[PDB]
Amino acid sequence: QIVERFGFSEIMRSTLEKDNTVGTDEALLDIYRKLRPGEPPTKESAQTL
Amino acid sequence: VSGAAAAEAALMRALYDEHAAVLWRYALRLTGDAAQAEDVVQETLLRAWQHPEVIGDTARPARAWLFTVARNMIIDERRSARFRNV
RNA sequence: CUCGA
DNA sequence: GCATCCGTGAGTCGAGG
DNA sequence: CGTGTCAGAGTGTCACGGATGC
Incomplete structure (x- = not known):
């Protein structure tokens, strides 16, 4: 979906x-x-901040 | 044996990696001085090493025991000696 | 902080 | 072997807060 | 004294040189 949006450049x-x-x-x-x-990186401690 | 004394040092190094950096940002808002927050962190974990009751039960939140120990240190630092000079 | 040459 | 980044410098004097 | 949820900073300079670094 990133290539679909920014593909023209x-x-x-x-x-x-x-x-x-x-x-x-x-x-x-x-x-x-x-x-x-x-700090310990948790998938849900970065999803929170 | 000799490997049992090294397990005590590997236990302290564990709670550093999960609580020290989070406890530092707590003391920083309470004092405002980053160099003072590091002083609060070392004193807090030093009491954890001296209290085996807080390192015993993992089924009980140990992170919270630190935030209140840090609260009590900052409120004591907030008494007479700071009152006049600071 | 604000101003004078 | 070189682009990066760090550390250095950026008028003088005076009055009141 | 004892301590058992978690709550969390300032941000419009720049020229210039040389040690620092992928």
Whole structure:
């Protein structure tokens, strides 16, 4: 659904490809560990904040 | 034996990883000084290491015992010595 | 904080 | 081997808060 | 003194050089 919305530009096709991690429960923990470091990352502790 | 004393240190290192960083943000709002919150965290977990009753029951919330110990330390720090000078 | 050359 | 990022600097004097 | 839910900061400079780093 991301490629469907941002497909008309080549600068967004280069973003999802250069991306490091994929997954709904994966990039949600990636945000948790950079925002509140030092805490255990739970799929539902990042879904909450 | 010697491996039994090392299990006590591996037990403390566990509660650090789940509660210390969350307890730090609690003391930070109560005091406002980040360097003071670290002082509250070390004193709180030091009393956890001295109270085996709080580390005994995992079926009882141990995180909450910390937030009230931190509350009592900050309200005691909030007495006479801080009153005049701060 | 606010102003004077 | 180089782009990044950190740390450095950014007029002088005076009056009242 | 004893302590057993959880509640959680400021954000409109920039030029310039060189050590720092993927």
